[PDB]
Design a binder for this molecule. Sequence first.
Ligand SMILES: *[C@@H]1O[C@H](CO)[C@@H](O)[C@H](O)[C@H]1NC(C)=O
Ligand SMILES: *[C@@H]1O[C@H](CO)[C@@H](O)[C@H](O)[C@H]1NC(C)=O
Lengths: 402, 100, 50
Amino acid sequence: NSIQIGGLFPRGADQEYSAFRVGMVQFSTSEFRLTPHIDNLEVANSFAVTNAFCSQFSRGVYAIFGFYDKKSVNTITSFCGTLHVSFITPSFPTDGTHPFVIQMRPDLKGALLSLIEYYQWDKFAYLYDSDRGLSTLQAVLDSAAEKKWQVTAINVGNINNDKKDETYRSLFQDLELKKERRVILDCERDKVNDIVDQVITIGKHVKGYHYIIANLGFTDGDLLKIQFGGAEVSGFQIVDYDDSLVSKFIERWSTLEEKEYPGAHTATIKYTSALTYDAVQVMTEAFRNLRKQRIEISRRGNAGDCLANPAVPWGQGVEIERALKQVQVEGLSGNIKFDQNGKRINYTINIMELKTNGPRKIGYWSEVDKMVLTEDDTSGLEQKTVVVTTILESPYVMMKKN
Amino acid sequence: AFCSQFSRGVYAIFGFYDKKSVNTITSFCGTLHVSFITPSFPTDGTHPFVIQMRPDLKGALLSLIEYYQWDKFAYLYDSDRGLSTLQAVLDSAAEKKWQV
Amino acid sequence: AGDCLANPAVPWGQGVEIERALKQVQVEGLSGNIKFDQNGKRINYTINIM
Ligand SMILES: *[C@@H]1O[C@H](CO)[C@@H](O)[C@H](O)[C@H]1NC(C)=O
Ligand SMILES: *[C@@H]1O[C@H](CO)[C@@H](O)[C@H](O)[C@H]1NC(C)=O
């Protein structure tokens, strides 16, 4: 009845763990129950990730739910590829087809490339952060030569937080040499709130500018500060709060005590945490299908040292790979399904434009269909003051005597 | 393999690393204080206990593109070798008016 | 030395003295002048342009 799994959590991911505990209760049946082993470690320090993964492998788990950084993603994917241990993660998908990895996050590269094609953009900025892999930068650069775009890629990541006022004021001075009015922000939801505040300081948020937040949590970050400046701000949202499924989840979420569940007494939830809740439903339904298929998975004994040479992989991991990669359930991230590689398939990302009345569901895409929502007859603002410019020269435009 | 040498008790490790495996060595040697001496491409950032024989080529490439007075050119790169240098010429493409 | 996944991480003392000796080496070789900074990157080096 006790199924052992390993948890690798970043120390600063409290809400991302609060959603994990809630998922344990919602999908707990009387047939069995999952037993987590949680290790809070530094996600960037890959030696700690190596020390943590091998801790769970010595305790003999069956799957591992965790995260990884750019500095540590290869450590996870290469151990799981040899030891045939299944890894479930909400971090960015691995740049390639790696077995025994269950990537809960969908691939955003297909979204951004067509949101650009929708607005008919041919020259824009792209401030990226390498903390989540250079997968998307190679996407915009490869398609920049095919469509003959004129793109400026700036590794805004490696910047110190003490000289941030003088350097951020210096980045926009370079972008002014082409008078760039179309920017794509590709940082995590933290550094975006840093750039957003520095955009307001220099006033580059009025009529004319048009930003595109490139992460799956447009509503997660704060938008009310660049809402009324007049700049059009697009984005992407994966947690559709309109669905009655999420609204059922949000209602129970908004009421839990914040001391036992940090970062949980609000009406919204970050796309990282929401994917975590939807991960438990993947794992629970994966083992339940092993039961119904009459498959025996419990370890024959001690897995031994992960550094065993030659590395002997336990065979039942393949059945766990095929069990997790063949789950198909419905959760907060909409539809959930995986291919033979563990990548998100058959999914749906909603597109969001920020207007005067707040975030507005405008569009959506799919790995088969691109930019289909037409249209948003509901909501609407019906408020548009057209800006007309002219020059003071008689008698065309003269200031009245009074 | 880094552990097969620590058990044997080496006092320093000469080797190489890839784009995918560089972070494994940099953080391992950082915690276990083993000294790594390698020619493999220099660490993107300051990682202690690593000796890079490879001199920083990216600083030399920028100076060369200036002397030739280029404005628009193609840059070919393989994601296998990496792109720490292509990143360097894409960051400096706005200040110095390059259409890469 | 034992295992590399030693918990807690026991860092031997003489490793920090080895790091200091390496970067303090200043000799001449096939690459030109070889001296290092406190991080381990080449300084006072020479790249020919051909
Ligand atoms: C794809 O998603 C649709 C909509 O949820 C679902 O009805 C269908 O069964 C899925 N197809 C496959 C092959 O999983
Ligand atoms: C710097 O390199 C030159 C060329 O090899 C050498 O003559 C000089 O002594 C070096 N500087 C120092 C401080 O050793």
